[PDB]
Design a protein around this nucleic acid. Structure first.
Ligand SMILES: [Mg+2]
Ligand SMILES: [Mg+2]
Ligand SMILES: [Mg+2]
Ligand SMILES: [Mg+2]
Ligand SMILES: [Mg+2]
Ligand SMILES: [Mg+2]
Ligand SMILES: [Mg+2]
Ligand SMILES: [Mg+2]
Ligand SMILES: [Mg+2]
Ligand SMILES: [Mg+2]
Length: 190
RNA sequence: CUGUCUGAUCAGGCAACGCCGCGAAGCUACCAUCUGCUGGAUUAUGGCUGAACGCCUCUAAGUCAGAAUCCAUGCUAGAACG
């Protein structure tokens, strides 16, 4: 239909300074800085004031309009990543074989080392992404805490850990073992 | 070793390689021995963030892993007008 104009309004909290130049967003907050390139989308930005930014698509068709609120949401996730952080909690689910999860360091790199998953002799290693912190929860038994400023990196590490512990050649309705994301929140509770 | 021929011996010739045992060298046999590499990108699929569609959603923009697949690495030839 070629909608003449579609708009979205970013909301910038008090301590945050968004910074956009040629579709390269640099969001700065108390918790650090996050950057994102949006050069694959045709959008324009207008600073209404220090607390609002207009995101506009001119003469966009259905899909190009659809790509507008996703731009808004990505920048909003950047904003809330540098002011509240992100925290994904993973629970260790096993029927018989305890899952032995350690945070090891080999070759100067951090790894999450899963052992004894379903009794297997194989040792699973998941590389920890830059800017992402892993921790074995003390307050909860069999819990892994994935935290960081970037929601994408945090959720992708959580997904890596969950996906590497898939059950093969069994009825997965019966063999429910694995490591699953149980809580998706923020570092700073609200 | 047989037959025959050189008078015998010694030493030999022939039997349309005379026949037999062993037989080096060379060739050769899963009938012998040795050797047959590790990276990236993907398919199906399972996912992340995420709109459309105030929710949801692996998908639309973007993105992760991933097959005996593919492209390299490696291996053979080297364009007889590179
Ligand atoms: Mg099956
Ligand atoms: Mg079975
Ligand atoms: Mg004669
Ligand atoms: Mg004759
Ligand atoms: Mg012989
Ligand atoms: Mg062999
Ligand atoms: Mg999701
Ligand atoms: Mg796919
Ligand atoms: Mg796509
Ligand atoms: Mg030549």
């Amino acid at each position: 239909m070629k909608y003449i104009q579609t708009d979205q309004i970013l909301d910038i909290p008090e301590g945050v300074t968004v910074d956009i130049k040629a579709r390269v967003v640099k969001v700065t907050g108390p918790r650090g800085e996050l950057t994102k390139d949006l050069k694959h989308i045709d959008v324009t930005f207008n600073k209404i004031n220090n607390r609002a930014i207009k995101i506009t698509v001119h003469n966009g068709d259905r899909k190009h309009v659809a790509a507008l609120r996703t731009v808004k949401s990505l920048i909003a996730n950047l904003i809330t990543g540098v002011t509240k952080g992100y925290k994904y909690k993973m629970r260790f689910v096993y029927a018989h074989f305890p899952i032995n999860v350690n945070i090891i360091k080999k070759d100067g790199q951090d790894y999450v080392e899963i052992r004894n998953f379903l009794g297997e002799k194989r040792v699973r290693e998941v590389k920890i992404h830059e800017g992402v912190t892993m921790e074995i929860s003390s307050t909860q038994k069999d819990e892994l805490i994935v935290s960081g400023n970037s929601l994408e990196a945090v959720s992708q590490n959580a997904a890596d850990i969950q996906q590497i512990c898939r059950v093969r050649n069994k009825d997965i309705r019966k063999f429910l073992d694995g490591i699953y994301v149980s809580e998706r929140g923020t570092i700073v509770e609200e």
